[PDB]
Amino acid sequence: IKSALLVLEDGTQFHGRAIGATGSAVGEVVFNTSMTGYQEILTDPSYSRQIVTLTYPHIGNVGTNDADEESSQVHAQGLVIRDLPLIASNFRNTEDLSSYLKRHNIVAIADIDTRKLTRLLREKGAQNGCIIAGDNPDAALALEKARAFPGLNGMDLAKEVTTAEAYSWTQGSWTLTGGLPQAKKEDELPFHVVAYDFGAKRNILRMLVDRGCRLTIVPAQTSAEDVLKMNPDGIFLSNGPGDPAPCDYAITAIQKFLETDIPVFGICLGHQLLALASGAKTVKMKFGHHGGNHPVKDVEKNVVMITAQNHGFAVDEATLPANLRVTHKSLFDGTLQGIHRTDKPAFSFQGHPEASPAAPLFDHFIELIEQYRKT
Amino acid sequence: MPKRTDIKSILILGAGPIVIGQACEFDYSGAQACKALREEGYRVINVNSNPATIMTDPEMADATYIEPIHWEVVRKIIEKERPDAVLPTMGGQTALNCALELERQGVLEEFGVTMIGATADAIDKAEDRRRFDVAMKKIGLETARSGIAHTMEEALAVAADVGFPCIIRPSFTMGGSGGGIAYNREEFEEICARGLDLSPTKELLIDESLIGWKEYEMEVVRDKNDNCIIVCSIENFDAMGIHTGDSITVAPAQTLTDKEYQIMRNASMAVLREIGVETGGSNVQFAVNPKNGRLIVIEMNPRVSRSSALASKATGFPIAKVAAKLAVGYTLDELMNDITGGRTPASFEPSIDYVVTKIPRFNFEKFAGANDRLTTQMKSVGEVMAIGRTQQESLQKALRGLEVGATGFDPKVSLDDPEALTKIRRELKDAGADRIWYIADAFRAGLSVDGVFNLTNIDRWFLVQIEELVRLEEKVAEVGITGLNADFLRQLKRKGFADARLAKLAGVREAEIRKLRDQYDLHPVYKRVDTCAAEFATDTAYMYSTYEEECEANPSTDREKIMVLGGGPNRIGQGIEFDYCCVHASLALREDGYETIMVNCNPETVSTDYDTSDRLYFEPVTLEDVLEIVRIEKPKGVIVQYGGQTPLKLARALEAAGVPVIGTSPDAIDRAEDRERFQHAVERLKLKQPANATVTAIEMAVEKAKEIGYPLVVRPSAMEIVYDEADLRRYFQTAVLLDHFLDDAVEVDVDAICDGEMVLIGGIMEHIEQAGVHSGDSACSLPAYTLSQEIQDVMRQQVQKLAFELQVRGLMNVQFAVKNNEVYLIEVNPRAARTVPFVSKATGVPLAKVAARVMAGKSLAEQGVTKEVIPPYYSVKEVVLPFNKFPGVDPLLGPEMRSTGEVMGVGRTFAEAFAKAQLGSNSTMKKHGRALLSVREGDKERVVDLAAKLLKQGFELDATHGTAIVLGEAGINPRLVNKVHEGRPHIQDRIKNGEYTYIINTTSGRRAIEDSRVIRRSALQYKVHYDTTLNGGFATAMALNADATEKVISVQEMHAQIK
Ligand SMILES: Nc1ncnc2c1ncn2[C@@H]1O[C@H](COP(=O)(O)OP(=O)(O)O)[C@@H](O)[C@H]1O
Ligand SMILES: Nc1ncnc2c1ncn2[C@@H]1O[C@H](COP(=O)(O)OP(=O)(O)O)[C@@H](O)[C@H]1O
Ligand SMILES: CC[N+](CC)(CC)CC
Ligand SMILES: NCCC[C@H](N)C(=O)O
Ligand SMILES: [Cl-]
Ligand SMILES: [Cl-]
Ligand SMILES: [Cl-]
Ligand SMILES: [Cl-]
Ligand SMILES: [Cl-]
Ligand SMILES: [Cl-]
Ligand SMILES: [K+]
Ligand SMILES: [K+]
Ligand SMILES: [K+]
Ligand SMILES: [K+]
Ligand SMILES: [K+]
Ligand SMILES: [K+]
Ligand SMILES: [Mn+2]
Ligand SMILES: [Mn+2]
Ligand SMILES: [Mn+2]
């Protein structure tokens, strides 16, 4: 009997089983509705300081594998699921889930009413909680630590996950046949993009590569000046965790590019920064958007896309500046999903595009980058 | 784009009588399509020869046609209704097939009927196997190495090529009809000959084996704007090599990585784009090599199907409804999501927080000689579904809900049988209907997961789970009831163990486990289905039970509730008919103002459509499960008389437990259901019953048998007719009640209602086939076509006497046999019978709605339904038998029911109704040719007339030895034909060569039967119409004088003729 217990700020207790590391984990608790892709969710920096609850009862049916790691590490504060399968059963699995969580030193709990949880979070919006796995979990302690947690509102999380020193990435997409490809050589990539690592996902990067982009990943705070200095065919503002608001650094920078005719493309957190730098305002969502079945409309084309969402805040459509044209909204809740500068070569998408081998978005970026070099 | 306006009227093509591979799902889908369109202001016209459908209820549509689903007939319908469009994707392959014929006959052109949902070309592109295979390659998706064959020589050449075993799939068929797995040349010629003949396009696709790979399906919907969604993913439990319909399957997929899932999801979409499905749903099937994720596209079905119904139930996303709207120009983004209180659009991909399990239902025990191994051709007769929070929970609930007497993994073999390991092994290697149970036995017998995997190819992910259940069962057995502490019991309940299974384990009574649960306060909670993993609230109460913390039932404290117990999965003898009644009970009482609660777990039914009731509990219909509901709902009344045998059997127990059972008491039900109790009542009532005896021992019987008098009906405590002493014994060996067999008697069914004050005769149906041929397999007429009024009045009176005596409150059914101007009682069924739907359709009175009211307290007088209705037209009911699914079976009628479904024929005369009924039953009868006559002794007299009637109609005759002698003496000289042993050429030869267009063959006597088997089997194999009863043959004769395509009439119109 390896106990575990998760307590919400509100005093709501969930008793179950420990399936990860021994310890405690605290953070904002969210629910993700994805039926597949747990590993990728876990390794997403977007999840920093978050306690992830998965609605799909069986989590771990396929084990884990490096290829399914979206970052160099596990960014989830903790993991809450309903049932941890007896075995992993997939030709690609290299390590069962429990083992993996242990290795990444993650505190996970199993065997609780995830559905009840989810409904809570959905009804009364997000909540900070604490998980305790070990011998005799202390509920009071847990509640304490739960209440004690600062909160993600106004928390710059981007700084905490960004890389230390810039770097190049010339790696493209995975294939069933090829797996993860070898890194491309510089003379192999037409364009040269500079990516602001606001806690970006490996997929996106491979995607840009896929499109001829040789990339230089830079830390969060890097100065436009410093950036502009590399003569970049374009600039890309990756996805990332936390509140965008407090990232004065990047905002400043952004605006700087905005005076330039350089193409700028933002995804998720970067979509919020662009917004900000464009004058608009960001709000923190009741529970957010976490899952992979989210309908998003491209108002311009009147076509719906089924997307992947992993956001805690949003950009207020009321407070938009006229230099900001709405490009996409959420079909689930009307929220703003994308924008473009009426006046500049800059636009962004809230969701998280994915490879077939989004594309429209991505492609645009390129055509934009071309138009720009064709100048 | 919103709704189309160049379309006002739409013709919906129904699926026809229920058969293996094409069942209820289409009444569910069909009703949904009506509902949908009707809600969008279209004028709806539909055709369906099957009366037991909700879809054909007059109140569901504008113009309802219960007529043979023949292109000519439909033509008449088109010509008479002038539909602007035709929706052919909601009626199985019948509908696809018909749409295309219509189109091929230029009927559609001639009348300006536009085909919606799916174009003819798209349908063909998917249904023509060769085209389909060309599309995939065009799209760069992979398929099994294969060849198309139009002939046997071609077939053999493909076979040389792909090797054995190979898979055979005909074009334009489904449910594996006409296909199979060939492990050798012999098998190969047999299946190929069969599919080439069954294929509407006389074409086969022959593939190399992928037996053992994983099997997956995806449900897709795509709008005109090109929006596209996966409604559901399905991972099959049973590997490739066993048809999806005969496999245990789960939603959603379980063992694919996100990456493989996406690749599969991309493929699915591409498949629809290439085929051309632009405004509807489709099911895409794939195969996956567990060793390397290699993906192979198998097929696609451009329409609704058994999986989409399953998928719809599984997710709460009403596939067919949505699709019916896309058909009329709507787009996904424009439609609201049904269960989330219209709060979100239909344009999204569902997500679920539970596991759905579906288990097929078989009826092998009704088919003697039948190959009972699972293969690529469907053999199942129904299915059950279950919802659980875990796969374990999910699976066990399905098991217990299967209606096969299981309580979960009950054992099949004995721990101490030295041969078991060997039986197990067999059962595992070559799956049958019981495999699931054998898997558990294997684990009890000491085989490992890997050992089972290897024999079964079932994913270990699943296997380990069953093994863990077994080990838990074993503990239960060790510790016993005393070890059943709260923690442990709770654990067990969480893995879905049933009180009853636990009870057998602990060697106590199910009721004891139940008590223990009460003590501990260990009861399940109810979750709601919502399509979105609880991301959005739902205002629908579509629920399932589970052992968790939070309960979402939130029962109303508000109204007077009525509970309706469903029948579970369909089975032979327990079909759509019962479900129809259930639905009506619900619709009527809801409309009346009660809160209606429905309890059922059959994924294919309208009963399990959340629209049908106020509350739906998608649960196994068992005592445990029901009681838990009752526990919390505290209903005013519970109806147990409408779902068939299933709820019927729970009756006493429920009441014992204090459930408020309404309508005919459980005791009353018993009086009728128990033979003894029953003979006493008859005795009491001074009625007439055949003589009978209960015999223990043999010699006892032989004696008793002398009293009773042969021939006799030998019903144990599988039926049989014994003619003599020798026979008696003879049976005795192979093999109790004993009943004198009423030879040459007319069989009649009577459906009536009793409110304790009066009795309503719903209908008197006269069977065409005599007593001895199960009512469920007999054709019949309303009104009777030969019985005297005198004698019908006698039955009427007995019905009334019996109704009162037995205390019936609601529906009842009476079965009599008429011989020599004397009425004999065969039995009483104090509940809704399978003829109810037909009777309602034929008389315009919704008996189920009426009896339901009675049951709830509204008398017949209060309701204004007190006079028997005798319609001005004839209504004939004919059946459909599954013998073609089991060639090894002798396609012969008898005292045990084997039919899967039925159709209705409406006519000005008996001849006309019969003719329509026969055509509707897919009879290959022709109005000309050569007829073969080979009848039993007794029939030798009446045959002459039959022979003459055939002669008048322009037929030529053949006959075997004895028959010929008789005909000669009467003056008819048929062409003599050889009995196989007699020489050549003989019957088989002739039947085989196409010499006959009709065959009449009657036989009396186990041994005489076994001999003649060959005629019947060839007739069937060769598609020659055949009658096995003299009455039947006469009826067929009468029908020669009619033209089933001459006139059509809508149900509205029929009803309107009733005064
Ligand atoms: N190459 C193959 N090898 C093994 N089994 C196969 C192969 N192709 C199909 N099957 C099996 O036969 C079934 C029926 O084939 P399918 O193409 O779906 O026919 P239908 O349209 O009649 O359903 C599949 O569900 C699967 O179990
Ligand atoms: N004594 C009998 N004489 C003639 N036919 C009978 C007799 N008993 C039963 N049958 C035949 O057997 C069938 C089944 O008997 P019944 O009691 O109605 O069985 P079930 O319980 O299956 O409905 C009848 O529909 C009828 O054709
Ligand atoms: C599957 C139903 N049928 C083919 C579509 C065969 C009985 C109707 C003729
Ligand atoms: N009414 C049941 C079907 C009859 C079949 N033609 C037979 O005579 O056996
Ligand atoms: Cl819990
Ligand atoms: Cl078919
Ligand atoms: Cl392979
Ligand atoms: Cl214990
Ligand atoms: Cl019945
Ligand atoms: Cl068979
Ligand atoms: K728990
Ligand atoms: K038209
Ligand atoms: K097909
Ligand atoms: K299968
Ligand atoms: K009969
Ligand atoms: K009976
Ligand atoms: Mn098919
Ligand atoms: Mn199929
Ligand atoms: Mn009967």
CATH homologous superfamily placement of the largest domain in chain B: ATP-grasp fold, B domain
Estimated radius of gyration of chain B = 28 Å
Query: How many distinct domains of chain B?
Result: 8
CATH topology of the largest domain in chain A: Rossmann fold
Per CATH, the architecture of the largest domain in chain A is 3-Layer(aba) Sandwich
Keywords (chain B): Amino-acid biosynthesis, Arginine biosynthesis, ATP-binding, Ligase, Magnesium, Manganese, Metal-binding, Nucleotide-binding, Pyrimidine biosynthesis, Repeat
Enzyme class (chain B): ligase
Family (chain B): Belongs to the CarB family.
Region (Allosteric domain) (chain B): 923-1059
Key terms:
2 chains, A: 375 residues, alpha/beta, Rossmann fold, ten-stranded mixed beta sheet, 23% helix, globular, B: 1059 residues, 8 domains, seven-stranded antiparallel beta sheet, 38 strands, binds adenosine-5'-diphosphate, binds L-ornithine, binds chloride ion, ligase
Protein model, in words:
Chain B: Composed of two chains; the small (or glutamine) chain promotes the hydrolysis of glutamine to ammonia, which is used by the large (or ammonia) chain to synthesize carbamoyl phosphate. Tetramer of heterodimers (alpha,beta)4. Chain B: Mn(2+) 2 binds at residues 299, 301. Chain B: Its cofactor is Mg(2+); Mn(2+). Chain B: Residues 133-328, 679-856 form the ATP-grasp domain. Chain B: Mg(2+) 4 binds at residues 827, 829. Chain A: InterPro entries: Anth_synth/Amidotransfase, CarbamoylP_synth_ssu, CarbamoylP_synth_ssu_N, CarbP_synth_ssu_N_sf, Class_I_gatase-like, CPSase_GATase1, GATASE. This is part of a larger assembly, with chains A (375 residues) and B (1059 residues). Chain A is an alpha/beta fold. Chain A folds into 2 domains: 1-150, 3-Layer(bba) Sandwich (Glucose Oxidase, domain 1); 151-374, Class I glutamine amidotransferase (GATase) domain (Rossmann fold). Chain A contains 10 helices and 17 strands. Chain A has helices spanning 38-42, 97-103, 114-124, 139-148, 158-161, 202-210, 224-228, 248-257, 269-277, 359-373; strands at residues 3-8, 13-18, 23-32, 50-54, 76-80, 107-110, 127-133, 167-169, 191-196, 213-218, 234-237, 264-267, 282-298, 303-315, 324-330, 336-341, 346-349. In chain A, the strands form 2 sheets. A 10-stranded mixed β-sheet of chain A has the order 8-10-9-11-12-17-16-15-13-14, sandwiched between helices. In chain A, strands 1-2-6-5-4-3-7 form a 7-stranded mixed beta barrel. In chain A, helix 8 (248-257) crosses helix 9. In chain A, 56% of the residues are buried. In chain B, helix 20 links the parallel strand 19 and strand 20. Chain B folds into 8 domains: 2-116, Rossmann fold (3-Layer(aba) Sandwich); 117-140 and 211-403, ATP-grasp fold, B domain (D-amino Acid Aminotransferase, Chain A, domain 1, 2-Layer Sandwich), CATH 3.30.470; 141-210, Dna Ligase, domain 1 (2-Layer Sandwich); 404-553, Orthogonal Bundle (Carbamoyl Phosphate Synthetase, Chain A, domain 4); 554-663, Rossmann fold (3-Layer(aba) Sandwich); 664-686 and 743-922, D-amino Acid Aminotransferase, Chain A, domain 1 (2-Layer Sandwich), CATH 3.30.470.20; 687-742, ATP-grasp fold, A domain (Dna Ligase, domain 1); 923-1059, Rossmann fold (3-Layer(aba) Sandwich), CATH 3.40.50. Chain B is globular. In chain B, the strands form 7 sheets. Chain B has a 7-stranded antiparallel β-sheet with strand order 14-13-10-11-12-15-16, with helices on both faces. In chain B, helix 5 (120-127) packs across helix 6 (129-138), helix 14 packs across helix 16 and helix 34 packs parallel to helix 35. By secondary structure, chain B is an alpha/beta fold. The complex binds adenosine-5'-diphosphate (2 copies), tetraethylammonium ion, L-ornithine, chloride ion (CL) (6 copies), potassium ion (6 copies) and manganese (II) ion (MN) (3 copies). The site of one chloride ion has 2 residues of chain B, from loops.
